[PDB]
Symmetry: none
Subunit: 76 residues, 3 copies
């Protein structure tokens, strides 16, 4: 399925995922695609910060959903 | 979860914490992030000075809460 | 807890104490903080001169209370 991840620069990352993907795997995909270390990523769906060890399906994230990506810089 | 720590310079420190964190751990995070030794820090939530050996959950500190940080200089 | 000790110069010393602290310990804190030997210090709470061997709790001294400090010079 596709999901859309809006970033703070105003760019949207289109990802191909499965509901069975952990949030940690989603952050690995963003590291692929945008070069951002997972440690810096905070993913938000429906106002909730997503937990690395949970899956997209735990959050009821369906095809064509929108997430937000906030970056936390180390030492910030 | 995030908490917001207002400092006396007017700057707000955004921290990532757990309710299971001791106040001592919160002060270690502030030492990370701002370079302030824990010994100098006095943390205030809801008008109460927080005790190092207690947890955020003991104080019912919830996500997105605001604390204040006062600094006590040694010999002051 | 904090207590406030007004001195005869018009300066107020803010101290961190416990109700379990003896008056002798409070005078040691003032010696730290202001350089005044305990022998010179006379502490006053609620019109009463405080006895070294008693505790703040014996006097019902609560957080944010005000004391006065009078100095007795030796040979005076």
């Amino acid at each position: 399925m596709q999901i859309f991840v809006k970033t703070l620069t105003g760019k949207t990352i289109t990802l191909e995922v499965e509901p069975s993907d952990t949030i940690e795997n989603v952050k690995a995909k963003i590291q692929d695609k945008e070069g951002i270390p997972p440690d810096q990523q905070r993913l938000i769906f429906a106002g909730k910060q997503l937990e690395d060890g949970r899956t997209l399906s735990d959050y009821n994230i369906q095809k064509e959903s929108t997430l937000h990506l906030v970056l936390r810089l180390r030492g910030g």
